[PDB]
Amino acid sequence: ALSLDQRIQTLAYEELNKAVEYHQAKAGTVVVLDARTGEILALVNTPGRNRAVTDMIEPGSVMKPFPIAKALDSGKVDTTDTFNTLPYKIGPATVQDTHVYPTLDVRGIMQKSSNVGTSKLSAMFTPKEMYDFYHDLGVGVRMHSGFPGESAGVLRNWRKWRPIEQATMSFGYGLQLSLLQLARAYTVLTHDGELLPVSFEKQAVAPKGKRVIKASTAKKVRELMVSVTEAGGSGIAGAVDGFDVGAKTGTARKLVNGRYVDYKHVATFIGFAPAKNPRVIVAVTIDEPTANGYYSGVVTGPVFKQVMGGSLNILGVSPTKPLT
C-alpha cells in the first residue's frame, strides 16, 4: 500500500497551485514526510516531470541548519557563542549578508540567515570533515526512493575544493540536492540525529537510521529553528496557530550561463512541527516567482503554513498551545 495520505496530497496540490498562479511562477513542488519514518505522505509538482525527485537545486539558506548542527555536535561551538559577521573576502570573492550585523550568536545566525556566520562555523572544520558530513546527510547519494530518474545531486570531492567553495557550500551554493533529498536531510533534525531512508510504501519494519549527530544536538537545533517562525525571524509567514514550528527560509539567485543573476530566484521553505517532537516535515519550493514578491517568506511561507497546519489537523495532532 502507498504511504501517501490523499487528504494531505489534495491539500498540498491546492495550496501549491494557488501560490504558483498568484506569484506567476514557472514551477513548484511540495513534499510532506513522516518525521520519524521517512514515509512520503504527500509529493506534488506543477504539471510535467516529478521535479521533487528528478531535479537538483542549490539549497541556499535551507542548508544552514546542517553546518550549525555539525559545529554544535563537535563540542567546538556553544549556542551562546558570538561570531564576527562582517563581510569578508576569500581571494577575489566576497562572503556577505543582505543585512549587515557586526556580530551574531548562533541563534541570530539561524534567525536572520547569516551567510557570513554560517561560513565561520564551517571554517572550524577541514574540507574532508565538511564533505564527510554533507555525504552523511545524503548529498550526492542515491536515496533508492523507488522513483525512476531520481537525482543523486552533486557534491564535489573535497580534494578539488577551493577555500571559497567550503564557505559557499555552508550557506548552500556549489552543491545541489533534489527537494526530496533536502526533506530527507531534515530527518537528521527530526529523528534524534539519525538520517532516515525515504519510501512511498507503508512501512512494516522500523526503518534503520544512520547516526549523523547526537540526539541532544538535534534537539538544540530544533529549538534554534523555532526562532525562524517567531518575531524577528525570516520565516514568520510560516508560523502555524497552536504550534511551535522549527523552519528555515531560503531565497537563491539562479545560475544563467555560469553567472548568478539578481532578477531570477528560487524560493524554498522547509520546516517541521511540533518543534519539540515533530510528526511531519513540509518542504516547499517555487521556481522563479515573477509577481507579488520573490522572497521565501512571502512566496513559500503561506504554502508551508497551510500545508503544515492542515497536515497536523489531518493526522489528529492537538495544538500544544492555545490558538490566537
Ligand SMILES: *C(=O)[C@@H](NC(=O)[C@H](NC(=O)N1CCN(CC)C(=O)C1=O)c1ccc(O)cc1)[C@@H]1N[C@@H](C(=O)O)C(=C)CS1
Ligand atoms: C538564503 O537563502 C540567503 N539567500 C542569499 O544569501 C541569496 N544569495 C545568493 O543567491 N547568492 C548567490 C550565489 N553566491 C556566490 C556562491 C552567493 O554568495 C549568494 O549569496 C540572496 C541574496 C540577496 C537577495 O536579494 C536574494 C538572494 C538569505 N535568505 C533570505 C531569505 O530567507 O529569503 C534572507 C532572510 C537573508 S539572505
